[PDB]
Structure 1
Amino acid sequence: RQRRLVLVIVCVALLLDNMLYMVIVPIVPDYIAEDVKIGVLFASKAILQLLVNPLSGPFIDRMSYDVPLLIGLGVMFASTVLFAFAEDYATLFAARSLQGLGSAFADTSGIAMIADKYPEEPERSRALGVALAFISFGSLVAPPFGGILYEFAGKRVPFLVLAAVSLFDALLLLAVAKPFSAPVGTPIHRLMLDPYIAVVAGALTTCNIPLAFLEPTIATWMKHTMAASEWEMGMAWLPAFVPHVLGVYLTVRLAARYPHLQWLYGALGLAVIGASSCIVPACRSFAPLVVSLCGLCFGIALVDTALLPTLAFLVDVRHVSVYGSVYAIADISYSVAYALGPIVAGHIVHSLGFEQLSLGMGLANLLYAPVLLLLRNVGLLT
């Protein structure tokens, strides 16, 4: 039925949205010409998400996951046409803030719609795997090509083309869902106080710190230590798409085979992330570094695919069977690392070094990994 047509289009919206969050970080430092001046500009997407999601979470579970998606895809189009006609600084800051304002709606609505259109267990974790595989591509493989096109054509035409594509996607979604025709949700305070939800939300931030504390402070370290040209410094995350999709598929197949092993999968993913981030400050060549990044990226996929359906399963077993207000917690959790990283990571590296920050990150992840054992009793609460 329609069901598949909605899943594909929502996934494409998550791919284009995740491309504009990373294709602009190399371009911005060109038009600017205070190390804490750029940092706040780069850390404005997550700051706004931390003040809008609490006031937008309960709004999602009241208008049925369609009006918020359209609003988000309109705000994203408005934000994109701007970078295109954007120069100076204030305009860029406003565009970056509008990006977060638009992301506080679209991603949450899309994930909620994917989780709600699929109520059964063997298919929910299969749809939420395709959603994550579509999110990864476009954030891990696309920014290099965006930069290559920037160094050839500029900024005006590509951004207008991307805005046109986003508007086309929003329009055909409006034509397919047909929103132009015609239960009480749990308050976010009650959801946040549930111990299992808090445990899951803590993991969603611990497993993501060693991807926002490394992105802004890897190129300089690579250039200083290893003799690397622009090509390796630019295409350093590209050979990591394959481990991500492989891990997503493996987690989906294992969840289908044995239920109630999501906690084990999450703990294994946390251990892998910690081991990779601890191994990273040892590579003195391109290939070992690429392998370490492969391990780090394969660690994230397991945790994400294992613990994303768990929130919906818990909010279905207990509380009220309405989503939208339970993924705002996940978005808030992400927007803590993505707001605290790009501002203080450089100062931490400059005051301590690159060989201690990674050690601390790995120790934190490996120490939080045992905490996920408290979910071993889930599956009998049904």
Structure 2
Amino acid sequence: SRRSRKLILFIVFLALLLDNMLLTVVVPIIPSYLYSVQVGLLFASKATVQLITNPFIGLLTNRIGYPIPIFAGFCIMFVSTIMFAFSSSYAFLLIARSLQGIGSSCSSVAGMGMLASVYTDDEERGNVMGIALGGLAMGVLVGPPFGSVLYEFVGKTAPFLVLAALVLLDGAIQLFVLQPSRVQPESQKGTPLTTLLKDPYILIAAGSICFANMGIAMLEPALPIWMMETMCSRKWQLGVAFLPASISYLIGTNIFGILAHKMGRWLCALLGMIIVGVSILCIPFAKNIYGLIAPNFGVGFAIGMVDSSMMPIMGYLVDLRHVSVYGSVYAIADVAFCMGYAIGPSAGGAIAKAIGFPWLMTIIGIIDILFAPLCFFLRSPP
């Protein structure tokens, strides 16, 4: 086809898919590699490398162009996967995590920027960013079972080998299509990152996205270390308790990518934050898994609402009241994502150890509810 416009969507979607496959299949492999706390230190290290790397990639992607960081991300992700598979020492795990963070940052930021650049009209742009961000749910949904069956059936390194084969298969395509053999700088100079961080609307959007993803990032490690404490659940229910969140996030991200602009971006974000707050408030006093599935469904659906309805609004803001570039603003969006992901596990575990887990749920819900009215300012920015 001519320039294969939807193929950019496909490549971004599959890049996020495989990024989350790496981000999730690592969970049961970390304790096995460590034996043959510091178990969560790898996740924090990857997220911190990600955070440090996002602004530099944001400047780089309009310094030289969009396809070069995407190809570099595919190369560094393949290298990270290979090294992770052939990893024994703890420092090997750390360097694999660092390369993983570099790849995730550059791939996500460059893909979002290129997707924003190719598609300008708000309807289709919201649609395609919702479809692409559906990969963020698809990867974590298909991660655990695929990884577990390939790990426990044929070998430990076999899932990584098959994943590397898939990554190479996707790198074979979008190489001639994107033809990144030559550098192509941007038509116009972009706004500096400093002035974007002085813009109240961009800051409000980044903060709301950060708090929304922060809720899930806090819930991810704290829930398994809580059901064993009070309902004394077995290991069979550990994955099932967090399972519905992925389905809810996928459904919300896929459908409100078209429903959001029809209904209203600011109102959708406010409703999503309110639903996050009430659902997280509902989680702790529930006692059985039957009473825990529904609030998890709600929180996943509302996170999908916020993300799918408020990822394209950053591009909308920078297009309406700034220079028409998206690399830096999507870099700060990914900074919000992964600063939440960084201070999620470790800080959440620390505050749960110091103060009761129901108090943690209540305080996160209170913060979400209190910050939710601040999304009203996005109704009509000057």
Whether these two folds match at TM > 0.5 is: yes
Q: Which amino acid is 1:62 matched to? A: R
- Cα distance in 2 for residues equivalent to 1:51 and 1:42: 14
Alpha carbons 1:144, 1:234 under 8 Å: kept: no
CA contact (8 A) 1:202 1:333 kept: yes
1:119 aligns with 2:120: yes
Q: Which residue of 2 aligns with 1:338?
A: 341
* Partners of 2:211 and 2:225 in 1: CA distance: 24
Aligned mates of 2:272, 2:218 — CA distance in 1: 18
Q: CA deviation at 1:222?
A: 1.2
CA distance in 2, matches of 1:99, 1:75: 8
Q: Could you tell me whether the CA contact under 8 Å between 2:57 and 2:109 is conserved in 1? A: no
Counterpart mapping for 1:265-276 below 5 A: 265-276=268-279
Matched, 1:251 2:288: no
SS at structure 1 position matched to 2:219: coil
Distance 2:241 2:301 in 1: 15
2:265 corresponding residue in structure 1: 262
User: What is the rounded CA distance, in whole Å, between the counterparts of 2:45 and 2:129 in structure 1?
Assistant: 28
> RMSD of the alignment, in Å?
1.7
Gaps of 5+ in 2: none
Q: For residue 250 of structure 1, report the CA deviation from its aligned partner.
A: 4.1
Residue 16 of structure 2 corresponds to 14
1:294 aligns to 2:297 (yes or no): yes
Instruction: Answer 1 or 2: which has greater helix percent.
Output: 2
Structure 2 CA distance for aligned equivalents of residues 167 and 141 of structure 1: 19
* Aligned residue in 1 for 2:181: 180
**Does 2:250 correspond to 1:240?**
no
Cα distance, 1:186 vs structure 2: 0.8
Shift of the 175–118 alpha-carbon distance from structure 1 to 2, 3 Å rule, reads same
Does 2:137 correspond to 1:132? no
AA aligned to 1:13 is A
Can you list the C-alpha shifts for 1:177-212, whole angstroms capped at 9, x where unaligned? 222356111110011111111111111111111111
Partner of 1:39: 40
Where 2:64 maps in the other structure, the secondary structure is coil
Residue in 2 that maps onto 1:315: 318
Letter in 2 for 1:29: P
Tell me the TM-score normalised to structure 1 length.
0.93
1:150-170: CA deviation from partner (whole Å, max 9, x where unpaired): 233332111011112112212
- Give distance in 2, aligned partners of 1:7 and 1:124: 10
Q: How many residues align?
A: 375
In structure 1, give the amino acid aligned to 2:29.
I
Give structure 1 stretches of 5+ with no counterpart. none
1:249 is displaced (CA, Å) by: 4.2
CA-CA distance at 1:132 after TM superposition: 1.3
| Aligned equivalent of 2:31 | 29
Cα gap change, 1:4/1:17 in structure 2, threshold over 3 Å: closer, same or farther? same
Give the Cα–Cα distance (whole angstroms) in 1 for the partners of residues 121 and 328 of structure 2: 20
